[PDB]
Structure 1
Amino acid sequence: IREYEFYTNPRAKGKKTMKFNVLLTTYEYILKDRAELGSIKWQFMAVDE
């Protein structure tokens, strides 16, 4: 998911723009991948339950 679907230009190494619109995830992968998801300029957060 990370290197085939996050970025429009995943093979670059400078500023990588985002490709997806909405990312659905769970709490376990918020805790597991906070380093790879906290460094994203999110426009909206919706926390269910």
Structure 2
Amino acid sequence: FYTNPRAKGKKTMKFNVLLTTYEYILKDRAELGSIKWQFMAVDEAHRLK
């Protein structure tokens, strides 16, 4: 995730696109909600109906 993971400060990102599923969104919402996302793409949006 982090370009500088050993630093104690605000760590910048290293990746560009993160592919995930719904289960790990509901499992790791605390570790993924504190990221300033620029774009979001949700496949099979009828699950979000």
How many residue pairs get aligned? The number is: 44
RMSD: 0.3
Deviations 1:23-45 (A, max 9, x none): 00000000000000000000000
Identity of matched residues, %: 100
Aligned mates of 1:39, 1:15 — CA distance in 2: 11
Residue segments in structure 2 that go unaligned for 5+ positions in a row: 45-49
| Gap runs ≥5 in structure 1 | 1-5
1:9: which partner in 2?
A: 4
Deviation digits for residues 1-49 of structure 1 (CA, Å, limit 9, x no counterpart): xxxxx00000001010000000000000000000000000000000000
Larger radius of gyration: 2
- TM-score, normalised by the number of residues in structure 2: 0.88
